Amino acid sequence: VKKEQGNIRFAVDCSAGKDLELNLNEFADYVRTHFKINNRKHGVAEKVACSVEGDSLVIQTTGYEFAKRYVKYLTKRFLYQDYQGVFRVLSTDKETYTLKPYT
Template sequence: MAVTKTGSATKKSETRKFVIDCSGPASDKIFDVAAYEKYLHDHIKVNGRTNNLEDQVKIVRANDKITVTASIHFSKRYLKYLTKRFLKKHQLRDWLRVIASDKQTYLLKYYNINQGEDEEEDDEE
């Protein structure tokens, strides 16, 4: 933080960049990346209002990855929340989960359903 002449502290505006990798489900054609991009554009709130992105938040789609760049305070957790809402709306929440692969990236992966079936077979014996 920088201190001004009056002694009050001001924050530097940071540019935060987050990536959501949808390549697994998108390659299987069960996840529509274009619809997800539009959903984010319509539902991200800036200053308490939707459809108010202006130049503060930019959403860019490159193949099966969506990049969200924000020049204001923006939480990665908020992107996870919106992603889970999108999955629930399209009845994909039972099949896909949102995982943080690193500090700025989320990854959509399938639940490992086969693992649960193996455990059930062992219990029956």
């Protein structure tokens, strides 16, 4: 199935509540611009699309399988741009990650 892959959905619940800001639409641009299939970002938007559903952000694919670690890397990078102090990107069930605020 290394060739077949499939359609998969990974999501991050921001849970900031806008208490700590978090644009979310801008968050989806960060994931959308820096998502790379291989080392190359060429033709990423055909196999993968990212969209903001309410508080959470959803990364869905049509023919691609990627590590839920990647959503953890992309998120972490987006937070290093601005809100470095908060968010622990803990898992909250398969498919879903939560941007849990820090202690």
